[PDB]
Amino acid sequence: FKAVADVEIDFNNREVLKKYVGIRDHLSKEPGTRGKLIEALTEVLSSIKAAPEGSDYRKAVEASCIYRLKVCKENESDAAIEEVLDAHLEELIKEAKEEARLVPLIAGNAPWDVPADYAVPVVDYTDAATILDAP
Amino acid sequence: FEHYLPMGLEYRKFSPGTQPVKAVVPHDSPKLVYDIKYFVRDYRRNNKYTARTVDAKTTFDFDKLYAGMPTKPEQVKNVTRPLIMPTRGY
Amino acid sequence: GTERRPGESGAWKQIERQRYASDWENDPTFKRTPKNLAEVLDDSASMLLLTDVWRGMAYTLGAFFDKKVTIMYPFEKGQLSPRFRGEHALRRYPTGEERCIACKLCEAICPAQAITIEAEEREDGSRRTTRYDIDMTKCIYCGFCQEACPVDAIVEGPNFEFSTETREELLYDKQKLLENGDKWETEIATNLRTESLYR
Amino acid sequence: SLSGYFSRLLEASGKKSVGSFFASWEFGKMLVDGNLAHNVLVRATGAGRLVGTDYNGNRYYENEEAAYGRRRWIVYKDKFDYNPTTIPPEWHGWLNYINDYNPTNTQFKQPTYQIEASMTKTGTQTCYNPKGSWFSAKPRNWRKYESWTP
Amino acid sequence: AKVNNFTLNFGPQVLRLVLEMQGEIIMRADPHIGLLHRGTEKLLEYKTYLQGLPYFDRLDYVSMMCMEHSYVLAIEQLLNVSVPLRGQYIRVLFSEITRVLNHLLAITCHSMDVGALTPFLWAFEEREKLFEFYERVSGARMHAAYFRVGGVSQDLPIGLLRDVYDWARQFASRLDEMEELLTGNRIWKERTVDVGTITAQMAWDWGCSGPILRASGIDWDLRKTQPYDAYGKMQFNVPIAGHGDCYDRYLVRLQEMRESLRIIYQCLNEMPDGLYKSPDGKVCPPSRSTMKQSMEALIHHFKLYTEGFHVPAGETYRAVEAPKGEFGVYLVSRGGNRPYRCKIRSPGYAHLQMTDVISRGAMLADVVTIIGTLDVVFGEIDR
Amino acid sequence: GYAYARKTTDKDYIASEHMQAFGNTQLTDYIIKTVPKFVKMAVTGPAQSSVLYQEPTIYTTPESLVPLMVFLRDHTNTQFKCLLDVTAVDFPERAARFEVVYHLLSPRWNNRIRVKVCVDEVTAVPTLCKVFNTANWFERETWDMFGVFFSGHPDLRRILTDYGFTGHPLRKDFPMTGYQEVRYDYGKKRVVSEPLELTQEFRYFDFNSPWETLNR
Amino acid sequence: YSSTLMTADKLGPGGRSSVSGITATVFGANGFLGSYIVNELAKRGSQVVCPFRSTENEAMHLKQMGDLGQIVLLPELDIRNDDDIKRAISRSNVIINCVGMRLQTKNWSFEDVHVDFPKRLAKLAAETGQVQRLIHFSDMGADENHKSLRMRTKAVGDKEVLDAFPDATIVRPGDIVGIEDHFYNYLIYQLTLTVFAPVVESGSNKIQPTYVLDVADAVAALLRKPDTAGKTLYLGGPEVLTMREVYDLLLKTLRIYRDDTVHLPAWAVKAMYKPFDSVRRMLPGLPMTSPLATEDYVEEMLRDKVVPAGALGYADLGIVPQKVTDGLAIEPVRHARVGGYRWGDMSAVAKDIPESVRKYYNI
Amino acid sequence: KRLFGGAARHFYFEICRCLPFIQRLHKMEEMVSLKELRAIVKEKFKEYKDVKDGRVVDLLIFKGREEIETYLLMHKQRHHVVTEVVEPYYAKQRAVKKVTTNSPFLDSFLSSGYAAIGV
Amino acid sequence: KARIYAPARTASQSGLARTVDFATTTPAWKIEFEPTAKWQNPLMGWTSSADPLENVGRSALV
Ligand SMILES: NC(=O)C1=CN([C@@H]2O[C@H](COP(=O)(O)OP(=O)(O)OC[C@H]3O[C@@H](n4cnc5c(N)ncnc54)[C@H](OP(=O)(O)O)[C@@H]3O)[C@@H](O)[C@H]2O)C=CC1
Ligand code: SF4
Ligand code: SF4
């Protein structure tokens, strides 16, 4: 990106970059770390147990959390987790906290409680260039 | 410092009604002057909508979805931005 | 410069924040505290004795002694192109016969519905209009009628100076549009000799 | 040269002497209309050359050393009621910078039905009016049928 | 004590505002709109697709061709029409000229509302130059109707790129002399710094887009994330600030003018030779010489200028990075030659909804600064 | 609050391969499998984000619009933070003639989605003001233009039409020119509304070919 | 002729775009009553021709009143020239005369305006053959045996009009109230803006004022009914009042707590108004001169101006006239009270008003 | 006991409470009284006395509410009340048993070839 | 009063797309109203009307 300030800013220092884009003032003044991401993801893994075992929602949340924790485990520096998960760690901790917050509302609504012969029609679109252009 | 208000003949030297060179504008491709068949390029009327089989007892495996994701900074692959929209050769 | 100061902050929450906490010293867009005597004198010569007002004043005084961009209408005019969409007009062949053949394509394409056409066959068998109205107060001056015409009968000419005192003077019938074409024919033909290379 | 200035002033105003110029009603309106005053006294007497004259009497000047879009100007012959609707269409595209053609360098094709340019008639009672108007010689009732008269 | 709010009516003369104050501090702002609601969404159902195109010039009438772009792209997607390369380059070039015009007007009208009168008069002569560029290719200074389904309406006249290069050679000097009056001035800073702050969470929660979104530290440009025409080939930067200030939005808008100049220079050097219209004759009308010499061209000219093409049944939403944010069209097709439903999404409608939460804690003399920095035009707000 | 400026270099890429593949291919099946009771119908079509892809459309009941939108905002794989608009489409041939349409944008993964609810004239739709703050003015406009009542709204009042305007103009049975028109009366010294009279009535041109195949 | 005027060419339901079939010439169309008559005719789809003598700025308000082509404006009217009168009526089947005068001038006398011009107008109207109706306006107090000159010249001109055009209708309304009238406006300018207001004698002479919209409706009702041709109608409101009662009503309505009027003998009032009546000629006419500062007004104040017994009035036209003392007619004089019109405290009735309304009005 | 929760009479009571402030603000003190205004607003309510659906009742009450605040906030003036509320009522109760023995058909016949549209 | 009907094929052409033959594919049933008064504009001759339902059934309701 281009910085509109006429002064020279380093931006290799990651704390300066987090200050300049307003992460400190507007999202989280406390710096997010790898341990806080691990704690938040384990909070999600504890919170999802209110969903039934056979539900696809629980499997989806658990698989996402397990992949995130494996990324956290195999990478020690927080810049590596930033480069893998394509965000700032403050964003990722907020994502995990929001995912943990979501669980009681979904569990109260119970979307998994459909009949056994539940049916959803789907209509898909095929482009003309599939049959007109070269295979 | 470049000056606003250029002087005589330094800007719009010729009026658009007195263009100094005659213009030859292409209005057709040379590939279509003598090859005029239309049904081989009827993209408008050849798109399809198909009703899928009823999405009930399918098998969403999350293991395969999360098994294709990277875990290290290198081995992350990114989709490059498309340079142009499709022109179909024209 | 784009630098910030504690005190030049336009609001109150940030004014209260800068005078009770040193969080502004972490932000890289702020100007730092002067460290020695000469820096204090530079900061005071910035705040007192202005010198930021004076740069704008020097620029506007340079503009006072510079050149001007005003044209003396109506002794001097602006600049337009042969594609310019002005007052509508009806055209003839060089013989003197009307080009229009009452196809009603310009009436069909008109998004404003500003055209009203009636026709019958002339006494020599020709297909010609008996009514051709253009409501100039309904027209949007798009030029779509000029594009739809297959015989170049209706055009938008190069005239833009046609303001009137009554609105009834802006409901053009067929005779006035032919009179406009008879007035502007040579200019319209000169414009169309260039614009036919592109259209 | 002030002799050049006065010769330019006399050829632009169309008068015969400075005494005839300063004692005219045209100079009286140039004391109260500053747009005409600037055009006659400053622009027409400056650097530039005369290009041509139309049939309404207006003179056309140009200066290639000027800024773009201020190279061409007109001196209207009607000093008291000057109007741009008296410019003929063969000078209109030159003065509006649409093309570089005028009668002094281009022979236009003249149609046999061409109506010459004259001043607008708006605000007077000889303006254009539609055929259903009160000001027409015979107003039209636009009925599309014929009534039975016994 | 039990202080009731003092209310105020702010202008019939087309924004109407009903404020509440607790002294000199505003507690509430309620905009009343619809004074320019002309019902263009209903009128588009009674037009063919070519007939309804000049309605879009009159939505954001500071930025015309960008409004045309999204409607054209929405039609082209359902029609499955490809645009040739030269037409894509022309569309990108005139979209960036349009963005320069809009940002000139927005910054100088804002600075005139604050009190600085000279930058308005300095920038409008540059606006006149870009209006001459519009007129030389379309014959209209503002409502061009230039972008069409499958390309552009006419080719570029010979001699246009020469003059666009001559304008772009001095535009940076004009932007430089513009900033000498405003950027390092204490009165402008004291009017604009920390006024109407927008954070990222509030920006996404309130549907913001455009230079508001970039001044709150969000890297989101539709010309780089979801590119359209030849914008993926263009090399330019996204300006980023991090306070969410009026001052930061002003700086972001100036830098966006610089980047638009960069894209304009790149388009002037890579302009290709070739077709500017799609060669599908059942969508695009033929040339006027072809129409007067072949029977199929005359039939297609007759039918395309009366009934128009039939768009296949379906729906789409297509958006463009308009100079005020994201401008989008939701087109619903039943199969006819007329749109069944055409919803118009305007960014200024969402930006004006925020005035209740942005003007809280501000004074009466900062309302006009907030309205000016949101960059609102009521044609697109009131459809 | 996402898509913070992180890379200081120029990026020549959009998204990652795995997440773009998931969003462009698997998102319909994912949403159907995780929350099946919320979804009644799905369409995967020509992609709001770009001409090159496909994107889903989700049909839901009004009883579960709010939980589905909360799930689509807060779930870790579907982070649809921005609500771009709310509108309606009138289908007078149906038993429930209105389709309320919600467009969403995900800044985290460069995605878009569309959500539809079918109701008639007298069935309320739950408001999304608590989920998205822009839902206020869009629901006010939808009530103004179509007469769709949004229950639980803080202040559902008309926003676009005239002050005394009864009637919903974007319905198919509402006339284009309306019923009333406006003029100044010298006798009453007031601007007065009167029944409609037109000097030239609107000419409707019926262009549609009896050979055309695409009309649906 | 009978009722073919209102039925034979009537096209459309009767709005601005419809056609009534009436082409009318209104003389004095820019005046107080003429503007309301021109509005009444043009709003129903009639073509109205309006000649005028004044500048175009004072006639521009008539341009709005009708659709495109239906208001015709003819400036530089000279009523001593028959060519202007002939051109203005050359297509009209209805002529309405609202030309009148209140003070004499060195260029125009009462006979020139009330006698000579109505006679020549009636003659030129009868010459055309297509004029089916001539509506001439006179005063309720018009009398050939009146000491006031304007009443006498008005009655003489009424006789000349009924002589030359035998089916012309003569209309004689009372005092006309309105926003731009010459009755309450000069009385309010007499109660305020002067050190004292003279009242002629005891102020016990009776008048019958009427509303301007009722007179405008009366013209259209006359044009409907064929029996009213050749007749004379007196237009007066539903209440008979004395001048003292009118002054008391104005002083109560204006909320003035000091009666500045003084009752004076008629010779004293005439002695006051005599110096500015012997100099009324050799002068082109001065602004802000009251029409009540003449001896003719003093002679009018010594007589009753009411509807005569057995005369044709509003009831024969089917019109119930509106009250003049209260309602919409008295609202303009309520705007000139001390301080302003205003609502009040507005708090007794705002008790059970909803939430946002009280805060909106800051109650 | 009262159909659909008695919401019609509750809304009527709310409008009747709101009415004297309307009369003061719109300066209708010498034009209509509160008794005849209450009777007129009551006559607006009886036109939908045969609605069999509670959702239609709720929508009608919501729309009538929005009408009453657009009258409260001076967005329609006194001439709007005259031309829309009280003169239609006085026309519907003034033409009853007219002084002429013409049927409604014959008045319609003499007026125009077609029925009148609107008011 | 309204009329519910499906319009017949035009005599000038042979195609059947706007008929009740393709009723399940395309909406073909219409709602139409009786005409009300029309007259000519005195100034221009344009056709005037006071009918609000003059084109709403024939353009929009299928
Ligand atoms: N209460 C009342 O006012 C009553 C009025 N009338 C009659 O009704 C008519 C309308 O009166 P009102 O409108 O109140 O009075 P106004 O003065 O307002 O109207 C008189 C009109 O006649 C025109 N006029 C006067 N003298 C001449 C002239 N010499 N040549 C050409 N035009 C002339 C005036 O035009 P300009 O503007 O150029 O002067 C003006 O438009 C009057 O004629 C009056 O006699 C009768 C009874 C009561
Ligand atoms: S230019 Fe446009 S508005 Fe004017 S007549 Fe032609 S199509 Fe109609
Ligand atoms: S002007 Fe041209 S398009 Fe219009 S009716 Fe005549 S020939 Fe046809």
G17, F199 in Cβ contact below 8 A? yes
G30 is in an annotated binding site: yes
Do residues C113 and C152 touch, judged by C-beta distance below 8 A?
no
Q: Pick from H24, H27, H112: which is nearest to G349 by CB?
A: H24
Please state the φ and ψ torsions of residue F55, each to the nearest 5 degrees: -145, 150
Reference F113, options F13, F28, F215, F173; nearest CA is: F28
Amino acid, res. B47: N
Six token digits for residue D124: 């007077």
First to last CA, chain I: 17
Q: Can the peptide bond before residue E31 be classed as cis, meaning omega within 30 degrees of 0?
A: no
Please give the Cα distance from E215 to E204 (Å, whole number). Answer: 13
Q: Residue C177: which H helix or E strand, with range?
A: helix C174-195
Strand partners, F111: F106
The rounded distance, in Å, linking the Cα atoms of H73 and H79 is 15
Please classify residue B64 by burial: count the beta carbons closer than 10 Å to its beta carbon, then call 0-12 exposed, 13-18 middle and 19+ buried.
exposed
Q: Which residues contact C29 (CB under 8 A, 6 or more apart)?
A: A5, A7, A20, C2, C3, C4, E243
C164 is in an annotated binding site: no
Residue E20 phi/psi, 5-degree rounding, is -130, 135
Contact status, residue E68 vs residue B33, Cβ threshold 8 Å? no
Task: Retrieve residue I49's tokens.
Answer: 């009307």
> Considering only CB atoms, which chain F residues are within 8 Å of G18?
197
Three-class SS of residue C135?
A: strand
What residue spans of G110-258 are helical by DSSP H?
A: 110-111, 117-128, 149-164, 184-191, 212-224, 243-253
G53 is in an annotated binding site: yes
Confirm if E375 and E103 have CB atoms less than 8 A apart.
no
Torsion sign across C-alpha atoms G105, G109, G110, G112 = negative
D80-139 residues touching G, CB cutoff 8 A: 130, 132-135, 139
Dihedral class, residue F61 (left if φ above 0, else alpha if ψ from -120 to 50, else beta)? beta
Alpha-carbon distances of F44 from A111, B52, E316, F36, F54, rounded to whole Å? 22, 10, 11, 17, 6
Fill in the DSSP letter of residue G226. G
Single out the residue of F204, F123, F148 nearest to residue I61, CA to CA.
F204
Question: Which amino acid makes up residue E278?
Answer: S
Query: What is the identity of the amino acid at D35?
Result: N
Q: What angle do CA G337, G342, G346 make, to 5 degrees?
A: 145
How far apart CA H47 and CA I14 sit, in angstroms, is 52
* Structure tokens, C196: 């036919």
Q: Do F160 and E314 touch (CB under 8 A)?
A: no
**Residue type at B63?**
D
The residue with tokens 């050393």 is D65
Cβ of A4 within 8 Å of Cβ of E217? The answer is: no
Beta strand pairing call for G169-173 and G133-137: parallel
3-state secondary structure of D33: coil
Contact residues of F toward G, CB < 8 A? 183-187, 189, 194-195, 197-199
Paired tokens of I50? 């006071």
Residues 6+ positions from G312 with CB-CB distance below 8 Å: G228, G231, G232, G233, G234
Using H for helix, E for strand and C for coil, what is the string for C49-69?
A: CCCCHHHHHHHHHHHHCCCCC
Neighbors of chain C with 3 or more C-beta pairs under 8 Å: A, B, D, E, F, G, I
Give chain H's radius of gyration (CA, Å): 17
Q: What is the whole-number distance in angstroms between the Cα of residue E144 and the centre of ligand 2?
A: 13
> What are the start-end ranges of the H helices in E240-366?
246-269, 288-291, 295-304, 347-352, 355-358
Query: Beta strands A122-126 and B48-52: pairing type?
Result: antiparallel
The answer to whether the CB of E15 falls within 8 A of the CB of E31 is yes
Whether the CB-CB separation of H70 and F163 falls below 8 Å is answered with yes
The answer to whether E88 contacts B85, with C-beta atoms less than 8 Å apart, is yes
The two structure tokens encoding residue G113: 């305006």
Of the residues E4, E9, E27, the best mutation for testing chain G's interface (the one with the most G CB atoms within 10 Å of its CB) is E4
The span from the CA of E362 to the CA of C11, in Å, is 7
Q: Check if D76 contacts C (Cβ < 8 Å).
A: yes
- What is d(CA E226, CA E222) in angstroms, rounded to the nearest whole number? 5
Task: Name E23's Cβ contacts closer than 8 Å, sequence gap at least 6.
Answer: E6
* Minimum-distance ligand 2 atom for the alpha carbon of C109: 7
User: Based on the number of CB atoms within 10 Å of its own CB, is F54 exposed (0-12), middle (13-18) or buried (19 or more)?
Assistant: buried
**C111 contacts E157? CB cut-off 8 A:** no
CB of G53 shorter than 6 A to ligand 1: yes
**Residues with Cβ within 8 Å of residue H22, at least 6 apart in sequence:** H28, H37, H71, H72
The rounded distance, in Å, linking the Cα atoms of G34 and G96 is 9
Q: Is C142 a pocket residue for ligand 2 (Cβ < 6 Å)?
A: yes
Q: What is the DSSP letter of G263?
A: E
Q: Do A1 and E237 touch (CB under 8 A)?
A: yes
Q: E90 near E251, Cβ under 8 Å?
A: no
C-alpha to C-alpha distance for E272 and E275, rounded to whole angstroms: 9
List of residues 6+ apart from C114 with CB closer than 8 A = C134, C135, C136, C138, C139, C140
Tokens of E137: 């290719």
Single-letter residue type at G122: A
Residue G341 structure tokens: 């019109």
Closest CB to C168: pick one of I43, I45, I46: I43
Which residue out of C113, C115, C116, C136 would a mutagenesis test of the I interface target, given it has the greatest number of I Cβ atoms within 10 Å?
C116
- H or E stretch covering G84: helix G82-88
Contacts of residue D102, defined as CB under 8 A and 6 or more positions apart, other chains included, come to D51, D52, D60, D90, D91, D94
Contacts 24+ apart (CB under 8 A), C160-163: C160/C84, C160/C86, C160/C87, C161/D84, C161/D85, C162/C87, C162/D120, C163/D122
Q: G51 pairs with which residues across the strands? A: G74
Distances (CA, A) of C116 to C108, C174, E307: 10, 10, 18
Name the helix (H) or strand (E) containing D53.
strand D49-53
Q: How many CB atoms lie within 10 A of CB A115?
A: 7
d(CA E142, CA E157): 18
User: Coil, strand, or helix at residue F167?
Assistant: coil
Whether chain C has a CB inside 8 Å of the CB on F8: the answer is no
Chains G and I touch (3+ CB pairs under 8 A): yes
Q: Which ligand neighbours the alpha carbon of C154 most closely?
A: 3
- The reply to whether ligand 1 has any atom less than 6 angstroms from the CB of G6 is no
Centre of ligand 3 to C-alpha E303, Å, is 15
CA distance H74 to G343: 13
Rounded distance between C-alpha atoms, residue G363 and residue E6, angstroms: 10
Taking the CA of residue E193 and the nearest CA in chain C, the distance in Å comes to 5
CA C152 – ligand 3 centroid, Å: 8
Among the listed residues E119, E250, E246, the one whose alpha carbon sits nearest the alpha carbon of residue E191? E246
SS3 content of chain E, % helix, strand, coil (to 5): 50, 15, 40
Alpha-carbon distances, residue H42 vs E163, G176, H45, H48, H89 (angstroms): 73, 39, 5, 11, 11
Closest ligand 3 atom to residue C99 Cα is 7
With a 6 Å cutoff on the Cβ, whether G98 touches ligand 1 is yes
Positive or negative, the Cα torsion across C146, C147, C149, C152? Answer: positive
What are phi and psi for residue F190, nearest 5 degrees?
A: -140, 155
DSSP codes, G89-141: TTT-SEEEE----SS--SS--HHIIIIIHHHHHHHHHHHHS---EEEEE--TT
Q: Do the strands A122-126 and C171-172 form a parallel or antiparallel pair, or are they unpaired?
A: unpaired
DSSP G207: E
Instruction: Select from H53, H75, H117 the Cβ nearest to the Cβ of F163.
Output: H75
User: Is C114 close to ligand 2, i.e. is its CB under 6 Å away?
Assistant: yes
**What's the DSSP call for residue E188?**
H
Contact E352, E37 (CB under 8 A): no
Q: Show me where chain E is broken: residue before each gap, C-N > 2.5 A.
A: 13
B16/C194 CB distance under 8 A: yes
Task: Decide if E144 contacts E138 (C-beta within 8 A).
Answer: yes
**Angstrom distance (rounded) from CA D97 to CA E127:** 19
Residue F204 CA to residue I59 CA, distance in Å, equals 8
Reported residue count of chain E is: 383
Q: How far apart are CA G187 and CA G250, in angstroms?
A: 8
**Cβ-count burial D92-110 (b if 16+ within 10 Å, e if not):** bbbbbbbbebbbeeeebee
F163 phi, psi to nearest 5 deg: -65, -45
String of DSSP letters for C50-117: -SSHHHHHHHHHHHHTS------TTTS-----TT---SEEE-B-TTS-BS-----HHHHH-TT--EEE
Inter-CA distances, G262 with B59, G219, G248, Å: 106, 39, 13
Structure tokens at A120: 């959803």
Q: Whose CA is nearest to atom 11 of ligand 1?
A: G33
Chain G neighbours (≥3 Cβ pairs under 8 A) are C, D, E, F, H, I
Atom of ligand 3 nearest to the CA of C104: 5
